[PDB]
């Protein structure tokens, strides 16, 4: 019988319970977005989790928004292009978490979000 850890395994929603993704697995998820006609975008933060500082009313949380890395990659057809931006972000902010999100102009909304990099 194993006891589920209480520290060191903080999460980042969808896919964060799987082992660290390889470059190939990461590419596949990006391609999923592209094939689905969704727009990929990178976000980064030095704080990786939600908290409540300014309010505690229903539905209000701080730490949900992260910072946008450049802009949504509209018209992207090459998943490796996203990887390139991911690498640049990691170089500019090695001590920051970086996640990949996706937008749909059809559903007019954010519909994707998965961690892509975590600092040492």
């Amino acid at each position: 019988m194993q006891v589920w850890p209480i520290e060191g395994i903080k999460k980042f929603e969808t896919l964060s319970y799987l082992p660290p993704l390889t470059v190939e697995d990461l590419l596949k998820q990006i391609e999923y977005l592209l094939r689905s006609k969704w727009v990929p975008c990178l976000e980064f933060s030095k704080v990786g989790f939600v908290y409540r500082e300014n309010h505690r009313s229903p539905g209000y949380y701080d730490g949900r928004y992260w910072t946008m890395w450049k802009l949504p990659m509209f018209g992207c057809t090459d998943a490796t292009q996203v990887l390139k931006e991911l690498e640049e972000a990691k170089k500019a902010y090695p001590d920051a978490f970086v996640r990949i999100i996706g937008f749909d102009n059809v559903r007019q909304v954010q519909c994707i979000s998965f961690i892509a990099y975590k600092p040492p």
Binding site: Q2, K11, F12, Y17, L18, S57, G59, Q110
Partner: protein, 434 residues
């Protein structure tokens, strides 16, 4: 008269509320007569009739056809004028359409299968306090079905021991934990005490994992004053979601709660207790899809939709609950093209004897916009609630990853799960018992 109420050449108006009834006439009652009766008895000689125009207030059967269901059975389509209904009142809609006709002697049995809610009427309802999109944005969750677990045993646990189970389940990977439908306020556990301990559990698990957590706190009560009193304290605690059993509590009360949740930013989880009393039998009652459309109108962010382990019928009302425009498809129980003119959708909740091995199918059938509610599926894990929740969260994400890569969940389901067992001892242990 058959042709006062049976009008086979009538063209429905874009403002009419349409109904599809499965009618079983008594022996000796012609289908045209049965249809006319259904329309007449669910709508409109006395001198007062001369002080108005009865024709503008009568319901009318514009079509009837023998159904493939069984013995002398027919589907009768009835059209009701917009003016018969009180704006924003599901209660009045039900009263007007199913309040009297089911007891008519000339009918051996009757079941309401569907309703075409015109935009002119649906626009008079607030609808879901938030809806699918807003909820995902509020909780910052995307790309996968949500996960939850109902606390067990149902009754008998102290408020604190109840919260303990909540925390362990949530910290393991589930997005929500939940009060059983029967859990309101009782001698063994008063509601305020439960709200206090579940709040501690919600926040402890959230701080530990870094992910937003919630627990459907049941506000169902004996009176509207009590129901609101519970919603108000949840509001004070700042938790994200509350719960209501809309059928046992009722539509008048549910609508009030939905309004409170909208005014206070609370998500509203809806349990369908007692639905089987009404929607089980094919020959008499009201099909769940009608009860589902009614809930979307009255207001709810989540609604229980049953299990997946008939499929087409379930998928049918799932679309009726989530989509903006659903095309007529009788093969899936959709008797009328339904346009919701942007009313938010409701997240369908799948629960009932589901475990890790069902993850591929569930993800496949429902897609991301759903809540997969477990019971023993998580609480029955050999290592406890936290490991059980982890096993379910891992199993789900493994399915999502595989689906996103283009794999066939319906055919590769077992392999996907078996493969995930390799790096997840928790999942492996779960796959050994089930």
């Amino acid at each position: 008269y058959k042709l006062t109420y049976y009008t086979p050449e009538y063209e429905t108006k874009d403002t009419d509320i349409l109904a599809a009834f499965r009618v079983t006439p008594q022996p000796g009652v012609p289908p045209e007569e049965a249809g006319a009766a259904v329309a007449a008895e669910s709508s409109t000689t006395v001198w007062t009739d001369g002080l108005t125009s009865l024709d503008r207030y009568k319901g009318r059967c514009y079509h009837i056809e023998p159904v493939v269901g069984e013995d002398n059975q027919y589907i009768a389509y009835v059209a009701y004028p917009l003016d018969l209904f009180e704006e924003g009142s599901v209660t009045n809609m039900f009263t007007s359409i199913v309040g009297n006709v089911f007891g008519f002697k000339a009918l051996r049995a009757l079941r309401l299968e569907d309703l075409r809610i015109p935009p002119t009427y649906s626009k008079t309802f607030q609808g879901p306090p938030h809806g699918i999109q807003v909820e995902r944005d509020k909780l910052n969750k995307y790309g996968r079905p949500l996960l939850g677990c109902t606390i067990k045993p149902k009754l008998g646990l102290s408020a604190k021991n109840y919260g303990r189970a909540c925390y362990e389940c949530l910290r393991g990977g589930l997005d929500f934990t939940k009060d059983d439908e029967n859990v309101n306020s009782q001698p063994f556990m008063r509601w305020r005490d439960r709200f206090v301990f579940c709040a501690e559990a919600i926040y402890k698990s959230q701080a530990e994992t870094g992910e937003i957590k919630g627990h459907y706190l049941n506000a169902t009560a004996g009176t509207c004053e009590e129901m609101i009193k519970r919603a108000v304290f949840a509001r004070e605690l700042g938790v994200p979601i509350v719960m209501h059993d809309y059928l046992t509590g009722g539509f008048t009360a549910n609508t009030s709660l939905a309004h409170y949740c909208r005014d206070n930013g609370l998500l509203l989880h809806i349990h369908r207790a007692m639905h089987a009393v009404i929607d089980r039998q094919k020959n008499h009652g009201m099909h769940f899809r009608v009860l589902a459309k009614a809930l979307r109108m009255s207001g709810g962010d989540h609604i229980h939709a049953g299990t997946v382990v008939e499929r087409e019928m379930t998928l049918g009302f799932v679309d009726l609950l989530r989509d903006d425009f659903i095309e007529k498809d009788r093969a899936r129980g959709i008797f009328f093209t339904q346009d919701w003119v942007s009313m938010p959708g409701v997240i369908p909740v799948a629960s009932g004897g589901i475990h890790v091995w069902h993850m591929p199918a569930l993800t496949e059938i429902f897609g991301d916009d759903s809540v997969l509610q477990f019971g023993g599926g998580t609480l029955g894990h050999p290592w406890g609630n936290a490991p059980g929740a982890a096993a379910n969260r891992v199993a789900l994400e493994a399915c999502v990853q595989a689906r996103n890569e283009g794999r066939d969940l319906a055919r590769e389901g077992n392999e996907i799960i078996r493969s995930a067992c390799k790096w997840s001892p928790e999942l492996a242990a779960a796959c050994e018992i089930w």
